[PDB]
Structure 1
Amino acid sequence: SSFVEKMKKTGRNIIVFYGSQTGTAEEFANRLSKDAHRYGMRGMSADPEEYDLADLSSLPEIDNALVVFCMATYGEGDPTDNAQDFYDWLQETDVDLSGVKFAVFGLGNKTYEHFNAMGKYVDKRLEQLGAQRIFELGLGDDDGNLEEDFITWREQFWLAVCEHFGVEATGIRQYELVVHTDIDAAKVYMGEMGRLKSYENQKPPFDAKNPFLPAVTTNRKLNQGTERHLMHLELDISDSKIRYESGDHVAVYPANDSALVNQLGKILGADLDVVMSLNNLDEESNKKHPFPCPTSYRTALTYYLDITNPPRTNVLYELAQYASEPSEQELLRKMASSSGEGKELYLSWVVEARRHILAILQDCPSLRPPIDHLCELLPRLQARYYSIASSSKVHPNSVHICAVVVEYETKAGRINKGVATNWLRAKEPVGENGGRALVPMFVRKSQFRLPFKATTPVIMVGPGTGVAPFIGFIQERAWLRQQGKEVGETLLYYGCRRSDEDYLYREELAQFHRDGALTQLNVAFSREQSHKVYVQHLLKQDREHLWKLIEGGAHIYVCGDARNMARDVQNTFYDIVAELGAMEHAQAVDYIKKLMTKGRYSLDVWS
């Protein structure tokens, strides 16, 4: 099916494709799509996977055609899975795109190696093919505030649109509510993703759309201290046909705090147990419902919607119309402004204060919107990825997780709890008579991998939870040694605050070093002396040996905090290569960056 014909038969001149893995780019495209209306135009948003972009050459057949791309970048500057077909096409095609008018807004994070590689490539590639750029590439940075980057871009975009096409700003619910009163409890979604009763009746293959319900066999606290809670879980995937390797990620679909959900109901004065359905008013769309329907409000707010994350500007704007108090409405209304005091208050009152929806309704009492509209505005609750801490060579039937619970106090005087980590923390291991706890998950393949050759040495840097994939790495290297194969050096550079507060897998690691599996265990305690001692410090001290391994062909792996750690560790490695390779700093940078392309300097960082 040609998206161009689709556009002709539905009267649309604007099409916004989205490359998204966790919904953000998708939401951004939907917002741009709805925006067309204010300019006498008609837009639609679309998943490029459900189409064939070769059809872009046929875009000129629509008067005033305009295509916009909202694209997120993932692993190693690669495209999202739903944009992979698009990517591959752009790399092999040489079609003349003269007459095609486009604009690209890339979603990225500058703490990653290839910043907005996807957006940059699409934008650069369409021009090469002859397309005409209607407005500059947008560089959204989720390390700063993607939302602000977006509204800033959006504003300038439409102005360019008005200018080039000669249109003007002439100066709405997407769904409609249907309360299912006579429904059979059996036809109601209870939190499953995908087909109805998929949880109750499990059948492979399990993926993001059909998550497996494993049994939590273990859930134990890893840290000795008590300042934080670091836990180690083991999920039994027996009978799932699911495969994985150390380095892969497990994604989980969490549930919101029952208490938080109950408070939202109460403050909105709404029976959360009412079953209902929200139907897309756009008869032509694929997205019939914002989430599985019919379903009760409670279920929606617990399994399908994001109620903890600080709301984006469009959500605060719509809500404004439900605040009777004058000063309270003024406050919410301005929060959507491009800049000025409106932008300042947003960043301050919403973002920095980290106010979730309930905190907003509490700190703006006059706000009393209907629960069904909110359900339409809120983002879908996303799964959380964790680096499997087990090797499929040793635990083929189990998936291990190592995580730190997220809990902190806000400026707003409240106590925020991380969705997936507090949820995971409360999962009770299977009991002699226990109750299977539901931990909806699926595996996500990655490029993070042990060397093809067991003889190849490995340098692993993972402070804090970043130690996660390495537990599996060391598990496998031991297994290999037990298999009688020759195994090169296996060094781990771990780090934490204090040896009595949060040293993870202390016993397991020490035993591995005694068995000979873990060649070297080097740990940096950042808080046992006035000055901070980090992993990069230990790396420098060992500059001599590391350079030898590096020059010999060893593989480097960095996992954990991307914001600072990754940056410091890479800088030290530049240092090591420059000083001992005798080359210039900029040559060392070239050098290290080339190891990445050879797959010998792998990264698994997050924030």
Structure 2
Amino acid sequence: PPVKESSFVEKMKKTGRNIIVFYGSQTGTAEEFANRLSKDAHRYGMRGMSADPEEYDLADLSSLPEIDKSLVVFCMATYEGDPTDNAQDFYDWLQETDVDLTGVKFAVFGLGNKTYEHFNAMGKYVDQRLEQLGAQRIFELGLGDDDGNLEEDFITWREQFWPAVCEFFGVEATSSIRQYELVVHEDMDVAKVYTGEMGRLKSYENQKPPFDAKNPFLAAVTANRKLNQGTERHLMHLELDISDSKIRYESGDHVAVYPANDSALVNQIGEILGADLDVIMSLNNLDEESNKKHPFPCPTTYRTALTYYLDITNPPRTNVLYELAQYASEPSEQEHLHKMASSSGEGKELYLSWVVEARRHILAILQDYPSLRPPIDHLCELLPRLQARYYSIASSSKVHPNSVHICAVAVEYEAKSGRVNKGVATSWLRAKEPARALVPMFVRKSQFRLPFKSTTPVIMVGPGTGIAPFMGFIQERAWLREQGKEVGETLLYYGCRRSDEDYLYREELARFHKDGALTQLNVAFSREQAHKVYVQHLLKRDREHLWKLIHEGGAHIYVCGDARNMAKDVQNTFYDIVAEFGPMEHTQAVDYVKKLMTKGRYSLDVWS
């Protein structure tokens, strides 16, 4: 129950703002777009502000007309067909309210992903809803797809948005501007310098519950072992101690962690910029009105920002490269960086393959464009924030109330940029050894859950790391039997490359099968023969029986793992199963399946 800020309209009035951009974001993408749109306002004679809708009462939109040439934009991302956490209040309000928004001008840009059933659902709603309430759309709804390239969809929409804005309000197209000012600190107590904590100063040292995204709990790594047998890759199992954290969790929930960048990568960035990473400083908002005093916990050292608060590995967005251009002394290199923001032509094509496709991180760009030597402080201002990574808890709270398990594949690949890229969180996690190695973390509740009725059949499909949440399920179902409860069939459809290469939890799964915790352990080994053998091939094999459990046993279906292809193929296989046994046409099988998803009997936990 957050305490709302006062009317945003009155703040707009007091600060001569005429445009406000709200962001529905969870990973900071929509939040970046909002700030870019808000900043853009200046280049058109207007002045805007960015804002988290959760901190305000959107009912005040009805007051927006009181401002001449006022306008509100919504950059909303979608999550499982739902609004982001910070946009829930707004969502619920849009449904219940009946307020008249006559005179209100708006525009919406949604951040979606096409390979989802509910693509840009939130943006579609906000856009349609504001109009029903009586507001008037000032520019078409933007439909951004992260499946293709979201950054590009945004550029295209944006490039057309402002001209429309200008034409309607009749404003002219009226300049590198810093958002913060640098303040070095030659001397000051070490007790007031942030060293990586995410919120309250010294919150990592002095831990006080409850713990969450703002006040993560530093859990000790009690176990970290290699799960796979072979050496092709590195899959690992970690156990985090959460005793005395008061944290509650259930199988199906996710555990997030705040990682630390590679120190060598941090040191190189400083070295190539001739900067002293150990300088203590702060970046204070040049706009004293905003509640955002700094871009990250300050005061702090550059080293610390680059290590715990900044994203130095994902490809830089076009606006960041656009601003850096000024710092490239070699003409041709300044030109390339400047054109990265293009909505077409060689500039766009160059950005797409040389930066995105090749996965060049900031350091790589600084090395391939040697004339580019920006001042460290302005760089830290442009870089996006370092995000937490989520992992499907691999343990059951019934069996391990004080411990959270993680099952992850360490990311490390050859990038077309020529260098080897390392995953921020997994590299960091992998290096944690039980001593007091700690991991900042918090739990996030999910809807991925075992059936309430212990007798309800369970069908789990989780190839590769998709097995994670299922180890928790199996433990819990095994615990239920020990507890004298009556458990229905528990079926696992797992998959890996080779039984002697990356068969995760081989020994543990064998045990559960032996004791009957698992009614069936169906494993598809994709590479032990010439043709591929996948989990869906096993589902098809056991189609008759699966149908029986589904249509007559009320079994719950669970799919975890890769969302690009595996989840879809598994889904298609279930369509064919229903269609054959119902029986019914494909179209009716798709409806039947989707229904199971709404009635909570077909759940997902996939990612990319």
Question: 2: distance between equivalents of 1:370 and 1:241?
Answer: 44
Shift of 1:521: 0.8
Question: 2: distance between equivalents of 1:115 and 1:451?
Answer: 28
Question: 2: distance between equivalents of 1:168 and 1:467?
Answer: 57
Question: 2: distance between equivalents of 1:111 and 1:464?
Answer: 20
Query: Does residue 1:83 correspond to 2:87, yes or no?
Result: yes
Deviations 1:360-389 (A, max 9, x none): 000000000000000000000000000000
Shift of 1:120: 1.1
Q: 3-state SS of the aligned residue for 1:214?
A: strand
Question: 1: distance between equivalents of 2:126 and 2:290?
Answer: 26
Note if contact 1:18-1:48 (Cα within 8 Å) is conserved in structure 2.
yes
Question: 1: distance between equivalents of 2:554 and 2:93?
Answer: 35
1:153 to 152, 157, 160: 157
Deviations 1:264-292 (A, max 9, x none): 11001111111110000011101100000
Shift of 1:130: 1.2
Shift of 1:51: 0.5
Question: 1: distance between equivalents of 2:526 and 2:185?
Answer: 57
Deviations 1:397-428 (A, max 9, x none): 00000000000111121000000000000001
Query: Does residue 1:359 correspond to 2:360, yes or no?
Result: no
Deviations 1:72-105 (A, max 9, x none): 111x311111111101101111222121111111
Deviations 1:467-516 (A, max 9, x none): 10000000000000111111111111111111111000011001001110
Question: 2: distance between equivalents of 1:139 and 1:493?
Answer: 36
Shift of 1:153: 1.0
Question: 1: distance between equivalents of 2:24 and 2:415?
Answer: 33
Shift of 1:255: 0.1
Shift of 1:353: 0.4
Question: 2: distance between equivalents of 1:148 and 1:524?
Answer: 39
Question: 1: distance between equivalents of 2:417 and 2:76?
Answer: 34
Q: 3-state SS of the aligned residue for 1:72?
A: strand
Shift of 1:113: 2.7
TM-score (norm 2): 0.98
Shift of 1:536: 1.0
Note if contact 1:539-1:572 (Cα within 8 Å) is conserved in structure 2.
yes
| Greater displacement, 203-212 / 157-166 | 157-166
Match of 1:418 in 2: 423
Deviations 1:159-214 (A, max 9, x none): 22122211121190000000111111111101000011111111100000000011
Please give the residue correspondences for 1:131-142 in structure 2 after superposition, counting only pairs within 5 Å.
Answer: 131-142=135-146
Question: 2: distance between equivalents of 1:129 and 1:260?
Answer: 51
Match of 1:461 in 2: 461
Q: 3-state SS of the aligned residue for 2:592?
A: helix
Question: 2: distance between equivalents of 1:468 and 1:321?
Answer: 47
Deviations 1:269-326 (A, max 9, x none): 1111111100000111011000000000000000000000000000010011000111
Q: 3-state SS of the aligned residue for 1:73?
A: strand
Unaligned runs of 5+ in 2: 1-5
1:204 to 192, 200, 209: 209
Q: 3-state SS of the aligned residue for 1:390?
A: coil
Question: 2: distance between equivalents of 1:537 and 1:125?
Answer: 44
Question: 1: distance between equivalents of 2:547 and 2:171?
Answer: 61
Question: 2: distance between equivalents of 1:82 and 1:165?
Answer: 31
Shift of 1:31: 0.3
Shift of 1:569: 0.7
Note if contact 1:314-1:336 (Cα within 8 Å) is conserved in structure 2.
yes
Shift of 1:22: 1.3
| Greater displacement, 535-544 / 161-170 | 161-170
Shift of 1:111: 2.4
Question: 2: distance between equivalents of 1:137 and 1:322?
Answer: 36
| Greater displacement, 145-154 / 420-429 | 145-154
Deviations 1:223-267 (A, max 9, x none): 001010000000000000000100000000000001100111100
Shift of 1:65: 1.1
| Greater displacement, 3-12 / 155-164 | 155-164
Shift of 1:438: 2.5
Question: 2: distance between equivalents of 1:427 and 1:149?
Answer: 39
Deviations 1:452-475 (A, max 9, x none): 111111111111101100000000
| Greater displacement, 147-156 / 238-247 | 147-156
Shift of 1:117: 1.2
Q: 3-state SS of the aligned residue for 1:392?
A: coil
1:97 to 96, 101, 115: 101
Q: 3-state SS of the aligned residue for 2:289?
A: coil
Question: 2: distance between equivalents of 1:287 and 1:111?
Answer: 35
Shift of 1:131: 1.2
Note if contact 1:218-1:233 (Cα within 8 Å) is conserved in structure 2.
yes
Question: 2: distance between equivalents of 1:204 and 1:554?
Answer: 39
Question: 1: distance between equivalents of 2:141 and 2:525?
Answer: 43
| Greater displacement, 382-391 / 545-554 | 545-554
Shift of 1:135: 1.3
Shift of 1:552: 2.5
Question: 2: distance between equivalents of 1:242 and 1:112?
Answer: 32
Question: 1: distance between equivalents of 2:47 and 2:581?
Answer: 61
Question: 2: distance between equivalents of 1:169 and 1:496?
Answer: 57
Deviations 1:583-606 (A, max 9, x none): 111111111111111111101110
Task: Report the count of equivalent residues.
Answer: 601
Question: 2: distance between equivalents of 1:450 and 1:495?
Answer: 21
| Greater displacement, 338-347 / 231-240 | 338-347
Question: 1: distance between equivalents of 2:342 and 2:283?
Answer: 29
Note if contact 1:455-1:487 (Cα within 8 Å) is conserved in structure 2.
yes
2:275 to 264, 270, 276: 270
Q: 3-state SS of the aligned residue for 1:321?
A: helix
Note if contact 1:323-1:368 (Cα within 8 Å) is conserved in structure 2.
yes
Shift of 1:437: 1.5
Deviations 1:521-566 (A, max 9, x none): 1111111122111111111111111111114311111111111111
Question: 2: distance between equivalents of 1:112 and 1:494?
Answer: 23
Question: 2: distance between equivalents of 1:535 and 1:131?
Answer: 50
Shift of 1:112: 2.7
Note if contact 1:462-1:493 (Cα within 8 Å) is conserved in structure 2.
yes
Question: 2: distance between equivalents of 1:398 and 1:381?
Answer: 25
Shift of 1:118: 1.1
Question: 1: distance between equivalents of 2:240 and 2:281?
Answer: 33
Shift of 1:3: 0.8
Shift of 1:115: 1.1
Match of 1:25 in 2: 30
Query: Does residue 1:309 correspond to 2:314, yes or no?
Result: yes
| Greater displacement, 353-362 / 129-138 | 129-138
Q: 3-state SS of the aligned residue for 1:120?
A: helix
Note if contact 1:493-1:523 (Cα within 8 Å) is conserved in structure 2.
yes
Question: 2: distance between equivalents of 1:79 and 1:298?
Answer: 35
| Greater displacement, 126-135 / 501-510 | 126-135
Question: 2: distance between equivalents of 1:164 and 1:451?
Answer: 55
Question: 1: distance between equivalents of 2:440 and 2:187?
Answer: 29
Question: 2: distance between equivalents of 1:446 and 1:557?
Answer: 13
Question: 1: distance between equivalents of 2:538 and 2:164?
Answer: 52
Question: 2: distance between equivalents of 1:564 and 1:160?
Answer: 39
Match of 1:432 in 2: none
Q: 3-state SS of the aligned residue for 1:583?
A: coil
Note if contact 1:112-1:562 (Cα within 8 Å) is conserved in structure 2.
no
Q: 3-state SS of the aligned residue for 2:406?
A: strand
Match of 2:3 in 1: none
Note if contact 1:561-1:606 (Cα within 8 Å) is conserved in structure 2.
yes
Question: 2: distance between equivalents of 1:98 and 1:575?
Answer: 50
Question: 2: distance between equivalents of 1:397 and 1:309?
Answer: 34
Q: 3-state SS of the aligned residue for 2:171?
A: coil
Shift of 1:137: 1.2
